[PDB]
Amino acid sequence: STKCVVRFVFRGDLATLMLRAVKDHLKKEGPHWNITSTNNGAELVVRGIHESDAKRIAKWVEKRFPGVHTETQCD
């Protein structure tokens, strides 16, 4: 089945706080998800998720943290 990577890049004075708040939310709904942090705690990478969930979590973060950069790549 298709699997996807989603990358969130937070910018600004609260970027690291935003990343951790979002990571907490995603781990609550996907405790088994492969979620790691890069770019000095400003980039959040979620690996190996279904396309339906990648789009849903993309829309969730963009609605609430509009200044985030969101990239989704599926396989």
Numbering used by the authors: 0 to 74
The study reports:
Four variants with additional disulfide bonds stapling the N and C terminus had considerably increased thermostability, and bound to αvβ6 with subnanomolar affinity; mutation of the RGD to KGE abrogated binding to αvβ6 confirming that the RGD loop is necessary for binding. For αvβ6 integrin, B6_BP_dslf had the lowest IC50 (1.84 nM), followed by B6B8_BP_dslf (3.79 nM), PLN-74809 (4.36 nM); B8_BP_dslf had no detectable binding consistent with its very high selectivity. B6_BP_dslf was rapidly cleared from the blood following IV and IP administration with a half-life of ~10 min, and following inhaled administration, B6_BP_dslf had a half-life in the lungs of ~1 h. The properties of B6_BP_dslf are unchanged following aerosolization: the protein is monomeric, thermostable, has the same CD spectrum, and binds to αvβ6 with similar affinity. In addition to the highly potent anti-fibrotic effects demonstrated here in the bleomycin-induced lung fibrosis model, the reduced systemic exposure due to the short serum half-life (~10 min), high selectivity and affinity for αvβ6, stabilization of the open αvβ6 conformation, ease of production using E. coli, hyper-thermostability, and aerosol formulatability give B6_BP_dslf an improved target product profile as a therapeutic candidate for IPF.
The highly homologous integrins αvβ6 and αvβ8 bind to latent transforming growth factor-β1 and β3 (L-TGF-β1 and L-TGF-β3) leading to release of active TGF-β1 and -β31–3. We found small α/β ferredoxin folds were able to scaffold the RGDLXX(L/I) binding loop without clashing with the integrin while making additional contacts with both α and β subunit (α- and β-loop respectively).
